[PDB]
Amino acid sequence: PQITLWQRPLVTIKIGGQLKEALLDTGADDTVLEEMSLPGRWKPKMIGGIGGFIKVRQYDQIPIEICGHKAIGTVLVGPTPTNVIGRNLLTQIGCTLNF
């Protein structure tokens, strides 16, 4: 699709059997989701932005589906104020900025 920026670019994702809304965030290096359960190994991480840093769990190799596009990547889980899809996954669905 072509996605306008008049509004926040929110999409539906399927992850871990769950349906979730997330923001397509070209300013995020990583994908960060609100608290949720994921399978497999994780390690702690600190990620930072306006207002400072938060602690997350980093899960690698997580299957995600965004707009019918299957991808696989790292998902960070923690007390983010909003679900964000970062570049790590945006690349995998072939997403670009165009002007």
Ligand X SMILES: C=CCNC(=O)[C@@H](NC(=O)[C@@](O)(CCCN(Cc1ccc(-c2ccccc2)cc1)NC(=O)[C@@H](NC(=O)OC)C(C)(C)C)Cc1ccc(CC=C)cc1)C(C)C
Q: Which residues bind its own copies (CB under 8 A)?
A: 1-6, 8-9, 23-29, 32, 47-54, 67, 69, 80-81, 84, 87, 90-91, 93-99
Neighbours of 68 (CB within 10 A): 9
Of 56 and 62, nearer to its own copies (C-beta) is 56
Q: Which residues contact 96 (CB under 8 A, 6 or more apart)?
A: none
Residue 87 has phi, psi (to 5 degrees) of -65, -35
The helix or strand, by DSSP H or E, that contains position 88, with its residue range, turns out to be helix 87-90
Is residue 30 part of the annotated active site? The answer reads no
Return the one option of Cl ion, its own copies, ligand X, none that residue 95 interacts with (CB less than 5 to 8 A, by type).
Answer: its own copies
Return the one option of Cl ion, its own copies, ligand X, none that residue 17 interacts with (CB less than 5 to 8 A, by type).
Answer: none
